[PDB]
């Protein structure tokens, strides 16, 4: 049945875990940031090797991995 | 078969209650939106075909699943 | 009431769950309703089977079970 | 045996500290109350046999057990 | 045995559980206290043995242990 | 021999990314400060060697380890 691989995408993306949205404070390190997550705390935390550090800067929104809270993506 | 049943069992586990309700802050793509939960956080999250897309401007009220916070519907203003 | 059944019973009434106070919204569908939960969020959540859907009403006081956020009991009003 | 001090022990436990201060917002039932915790939502729990109710009014500080909130003592 | 010394108890201290701050509300008991805890809700915790109840005064900063939260220090 | 070297490597461990980032509310001895969390509470911590105990005045943002909270580095 053709509808069940359409149902299965539709539960697949539906499925998948979110990422956490912060926002950077501040770059420390090449490859570390302080995040204030809008989770409430404040953390420092890594940039992941497929990011790159140039793109960030203070005030600029990224997502974080609900493990070690390290930036794997930035926001428009 | 049992298949097909079973897929719609499951689509519609998540988007039965408890639900939690959440406004759009912007969409990020044509079926992603970063959504200030009512719990708090934001998210990135997926939007579910069970919404239009059109429908989701910011300052929408949502009902995300309790488990990943996908948008399994819009709420009526 | 003998003791020990007094104690069972107040062991019971101890250890059982908290319900948490929330006030409805609105109600959404037939057993459905957006309440705002004292804890800070809101949540669309089902109606117990127990409960009677025509006490809610926007403004009214529930109690929702811990796990489920199910409205289990509604809070009286004054008078 | 001893089921009745092993259910008074049992009951003991409970209303040993820590134990959340709340407020009481009103008794809704013989043994039911509605109370606003220091930690911050509004709970309906019950009230032990520890505590007399006619001490339970609105505004009255309460010790509430710190897993299920029920009411163990009345703070002066 | 003196460089590795310094490495271990430098450990040892980076170790050791840290203690919550609170803000003593008021006295209850005779080792029983209300604090306001810097976590947010007040609690009725106990006083350890080794702290003098004397130094307790309302608005006196004390350390709680993590766990049960009893009063093992006040700040002076 | 190299202990040293396996020692080094746990109080590395201790300073690596997600760190909770505090803010110092008051040194209480030359190795231990109360901090403000980021995540609410305040707590006693130690002060690791790989802080200067001279750089932690009241207001100063710190990164504190996950487990322990005990202060691993300073933020500019």
Redesign the interface.
């Known amino acids: 049945?053709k509808?069940?691989e359409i149902?299965?995408r539709?539960?697949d993306?539906?499925?998948?875990?979110?990422?956490?949205?912060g926002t950077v404070v501040?770059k420390?390190g090449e490859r570390?940031v302080?995040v204030?997550?809008?989770?409430?705390?404040?953390?420092?935390?890594?940039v992941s090797h497929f990011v790159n550090p140039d793109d960030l800067a203070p005030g600029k929104?990224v997502?974080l991995n609900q493990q070690?809270?390290?930036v794997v993506?930035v926001?428009?």
Do not use: A
């Open positions: 049945m509808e069940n149902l299965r539709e539960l993306r539906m499925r998948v875990p979110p990422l956490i949205v501040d420390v570390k302080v204030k997550s809008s989770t409430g705390p404040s953390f420092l935390v890594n929104r997502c070690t809270l390290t993506d926001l428009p």
